[PDB]
Scaffold this active site. Structure first.
Site, PDB file in Angstrom:
ATOM      1  N   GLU A 163       0.830  -1.198   0.000  1.00 23.08           N
ATOM      2  CA  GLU A 163       0.000   0.000   0.000  1.00 23.08           C
ATOM      3  C   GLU A 163       0.869   1.254   0.000  1.00 23.08           C
ATOM      4  OE1 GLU A 163      -4.318   0.311  -0.257  1.00 23.08           O
ATOM      5  OE2 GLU A 163      -2.607   1.683  -0.271  1.00 23.08           O
TER       6      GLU A 163
ATOM      7  N   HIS B 193      -9.459   1.579 -11.775  1.00 30.50           N
ATOM      8  CA  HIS B 193     -10.360   2.642 -12.203  1.00 30.50           C
ATOM      9  C   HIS B 193     -10.025   4.005 -11.605  1.00 30.50           C
ATOM     10  CE1 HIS B 193     -13.445   2.161  -8.652  1.00 30.50           C
ATOM     11  NE2 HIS B 193     -12.194   2.052  -8.243  1.00 30.50           N
TER      12      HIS B 193
END
Ligand SMILES: Nc1ncnc2c1ncn2[C@@H]1O[C@H](CSCC[C@H](N)C(=O)O)[C@@H](O)[C@H]1O
Ligand SMILES: Nc1ncnc2c1ncn2[C@@H]1O[C@H](CSCC[C@H](N)C(=O)O)[C@@H](O)[C@H]1O
Lengths: 335, 335
Positions: free
Chosen positions: B196, B244
């Site tokens: 992350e 996205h």
């Protein structure tokens, strides 16, 4: 309701801006006379193809556009409110939302915590609501044009169901776009017609009545119903959709000024869209009351009983709810 | 098809949206967790004026969120309207109030320029994730509300996919980490790791340690766009709802790096919510693409074939679609 309903509603500003952004781009007018794919719509809008397509796909998915093999098409049944040149065009409301209401509702939480409008926090503008709304002639036009279409069914019912023949002169205080006196003029040649409006709206209204052929027929008087500046032998006075733009305390000041200026034996009618008797709705009215919170100087929606009590406290005789079917409630009293 | 009144209702839908997020942010429903209360009492619990509190309560009652007079919170609604229940929508409301609602204010310019509006709305030309993660409270807001969105997908992914196939599992962009947590509950032996961004990693370490998974799930800071990825025996890699948030061109880079990072015989799975085959819906996905337009660095929604093409062009073998329970489509690629 379900958890999913709440998420949909919480994100309902997605749909709202998809529509107002499309109207502001006049996207739908690119489909007035032809069908077009995204690449062609974008090129004519001089917008990048990728982002134009993103908006077009959203409008199709929402059901406002059709799409077959990449070709967008405007449904015949949507032309009346999506096309710029049409009588029911929603672009007026669109700009009012984009300029005023969507920014102000952004600070709803703070409006509730302080019971205060958010014009200063959002705009850095300390002027009154109507002075802000009316600073530009185009903003006066948008507001009056969209309200006028909303008022059309009320006006049609009022004119068909109330006997205006019994009065010699009629004053419409806060008439707005003047479509009520205009409809009364079309029906009753004998009655004198006048409007009392704020200065910026008077100017718009003068030009519009003149253009539509009512310049000799409807007198336009600038005034302020809160300050007492009013014309006058009007045996019928109407106030439509204005009380809710002000705090209950101000509504009493408005109603007392009107009463004081009335002629003896005069009639007064206010028309509003009140909350139901148990103040549980209707939903659009309840949300309109929150709209008055964030934008106006104290505005709120009320029940029919609350308007009725206000008429009596202001001095009106025989204050009552008119027995008339239609989208508004009419409250009526006499001097 | 749709009427003018329908279009008006949707144009005004930011009314309902902000009514709910304001109610959540004021903790309004929490004052009905134990008792049924009138407006004046709820208003004292909240330290808001009774007038505006009642205005909000009437709106919530007419929208069907409250019953009532004494207001009552329906049992079926407690789970997502009460701040300490596991489906609380308050995280979503804060993300809407802080980021999404202001940015959608500038949708028109976003479309005209095919450009996020972070700079014009926030006066800040840092990254989407850098602006979003500027404040650990907004990190938590983002990661928590997305966590609630992913919970049906996660249950179905853990249900209909056999993770025992794999010795080790790496979740790039895992966010709140609830997918590794679900895999841990159901598959005690599989190694679990997360890659992350630095600020998400700080939240994650705290959140996983608190939940009792701190020794079980490796948290490794990195950057899939730059290629800074960990190496273990990650014979399954997952990328959930990240493609996205970036432009197709950038998704190419991400997928290329992921392919370079995976072991021979490894499997990669991206989970998205693709637009349908002729890119005309569904409605929520279509609007999420506009949400990505206004906020992210180039984000957009795609069709499944568009993702397939990207997997193939990034070098994945046997690129295919997998259908599973939940709102997500899995795209699978192998090395
Ligand atoms: N203090 C005031 N004095 C006179 N008019 C006022 C006023 N405050 C607001 N108004 C006017 O009241 C109108 C309210 S909008 C209502 C329009 C119309 N009567 C209808 O029924 O649809 C606006 O046009 C506004 O200009
Ligand atoms: N360049 C990058 N490298 C690694 N992670 C990234 C990244 N860019 C964005 N992300 C992460 O991608 C996540 C997208 S939100 C998706 C959360 C979760 N995977 C879910 O399925 O719901 C965020 O947590 C963000 O921190």
């Amino acid at each position: 309701l379900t958890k999913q309903d709440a998420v949909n509603q919480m994100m309902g500003f997605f749909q709202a801006k998809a529509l107002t952004a499309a109207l502001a781009l006049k996207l739908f007018d690119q489909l007035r006379d032809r069908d077009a794919d995204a690449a062609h719509i974008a090129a004519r809008l001089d917008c990048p193809a990728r982002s134009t397509e993103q908006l077009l796909i959203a409008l199709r998915a929402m059901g406002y556009l059709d799409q077959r093999d990449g070709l967008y098409h405007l449904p015949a049944a949507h032309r009346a409110f999506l096309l710029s040149d049409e009588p029911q065009w929603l672009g007026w409301l669109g700009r009012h939302i984009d300029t005023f209401l969507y920014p102000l509702w952004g600070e709803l939480k703070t409006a509730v915590r302080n019971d205060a409008h958010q014009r200063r926090t959002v705009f850095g503008d300390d002027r009154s609501w109507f002075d802000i709304l009316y600073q530009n002639p185009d903003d006066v036009a948008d507001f009056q044009e969209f309200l006028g279409k909303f008022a059309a069914p009320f006006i049609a019912g009022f004119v068909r169901d109330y006997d205006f023949s019994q009065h010699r002169a009629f004053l419409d205080i806060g008439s707005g776009i003047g479509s009520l006196p205009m409809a009364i003029a079309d029906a009753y040649p004998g009655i004198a017609l006048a409007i009392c409006e704020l200065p910026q709206a008077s100017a718009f209204l003068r030009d519009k009545l003149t253009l539509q052929g009512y310049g000799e027929r409807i007198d336009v008087v600038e005034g302020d119903v809160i300050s007492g500046d009013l014309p006058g032998g009007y045996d019928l006075i109407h106030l439509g959709w204005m009380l809710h733009d002000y705090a209950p305390e101000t509504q009493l000041t408005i109603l007392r000024n009107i009463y004081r200026a009335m002629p003896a034996g005069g009639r007064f009618i206010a028309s509003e869209t009140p909350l139901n008797e148990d103040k549980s709705g209707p939903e659009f009215t309840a949300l309109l009351s929150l709209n008055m919170l964030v934008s106006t100087d104290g505005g709120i929606e009320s029940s029919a009983q609350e308007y009725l009590d206000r008429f009596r406290l202001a001095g009106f005789s025989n204050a009552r709810i008119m027995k008339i079917a239609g989208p508004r409630t009419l409250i009526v009293g006499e001097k």
